[PDB]
Ligand binder design. Structure first.
Ligand SMILES: [Mg+2]
Ligand SMILES: [Mg+2]
Length: 203
C-alpha cells in the first residue's frame, strides 16, 4: 500500500556483507538528471511504497530523498549488475522506473565488457564500453526527456545516491516491489529480472 512520495525514508546503505554486495557497491554508477524528477526512494523496510505524483518538477527535486537500487545475476556466462532508479513521475504519467546494466566478463576478474541503459521498451548498448562513458569504473548515465524520459550514456559528470540492493532488503520490501501496481512503470529487478537481462544483452 502507498505512502506520500516525500515521506518514504531513504534506506541507509549498509556495509556489504558478501562479495556480491561489495561488487555492487564498487560499480555504483553516476546519474546526470538533465530534466524531470530526481530519483526518490520507492519502498521502505515495512513494504510501504511511494504513491508517486499526478502528472513541473518542484514536487520531485529534493536531493535529500535520493536512492538507487541494484540486483545482481548472471546471463550467458557474463556477470550483470543492474542499477535502477525510481522517480515519482515522468503530460506524462505517475511513477517511473529505469535501469542500466553493467556487464562484467565474470565476477572474479570483473572487467567491464559492456553497458546497457533502458530507453522506452528497449536498451541502448555500449559494447565494448566506451571509455568516455566511464569515470574510472563508474558508468556515467543520463536521465532526460527530449518523448518521455529515457536513460543514456553521457560524458557529463553525474551524482551518486545511497544504494540498497535487492539482496539486502527485507522480505516485506521485496514482496511489495514484486506485487505493487506501478501503473505505466514497471520494477525491472523483480521476477522479471532475467527477462530484462536478456533484453539488455549486448550481443
Ligand atoms: Mg519510464
Ligand atoms: Mg562469475
Amino acid at each position: 500500500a502507498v505512502i506520500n512520495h516525500d515521506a518514504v525514508p531513504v534506506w541507509p546503505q549498509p556495509e556489504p556483507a558478501d562479495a556480491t554486495q561489495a561488487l555492487a557497491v564498487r560499480f555504483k554508477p553516476q546519474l546526470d538528471v538533465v530534466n524531470g524528477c530526481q530519483p526518490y526512494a520507492a519502498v521502505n523496510p515495512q513494504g510501504e511504497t511511494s504513491g508517486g505524483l499526478k502528472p513541473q518538477a518542484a514536487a520531485c527535486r529534493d536531493m535529500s530523498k535520493a536512492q538507487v537500487y541494484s540486483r545482481s545475476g548472471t546471463y550467458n556466462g557474463y556477470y550483470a549488475i543492474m542499477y535502477s532508479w525510481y522517480m515519482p513521475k515522468d503530460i506524462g504519467h505517475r511513477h517511473d522506473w529505469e535501469n542500466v546494466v553493467v556487464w562484467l566478463d565474470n565476477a572474479a576478474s570483473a572487467n567491464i565488457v559492456a553497458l546497457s541503459a533502458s530507453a522506452h521498451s528497449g536498451y541502448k548498448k555500449s559494447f565494448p564500453a566506451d571509455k568516455s562513458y566511464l569515470d574510472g569504473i563508474t558508468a556515467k548515465i543520463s536521465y532526460k526527456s527530449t518523448l518521455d524520459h529515457e536513460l543514456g550514456f553521457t560524458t557529463s559528470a553525474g551524482k551518486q545516491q545511497p544504494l540498497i540492493q535487492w539482496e539486502q532488503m527485507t522480505q516485506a520490501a521485496r514482496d511489495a516491489l514484486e506485487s505493487t501496481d506501478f501503473g505505466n512503470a514497471n520494477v525491472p529487478f523483480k521476477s522479471n529480472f532475467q527477462d530484462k537481462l536478456v533484453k539488455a544483452f549486448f550481443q
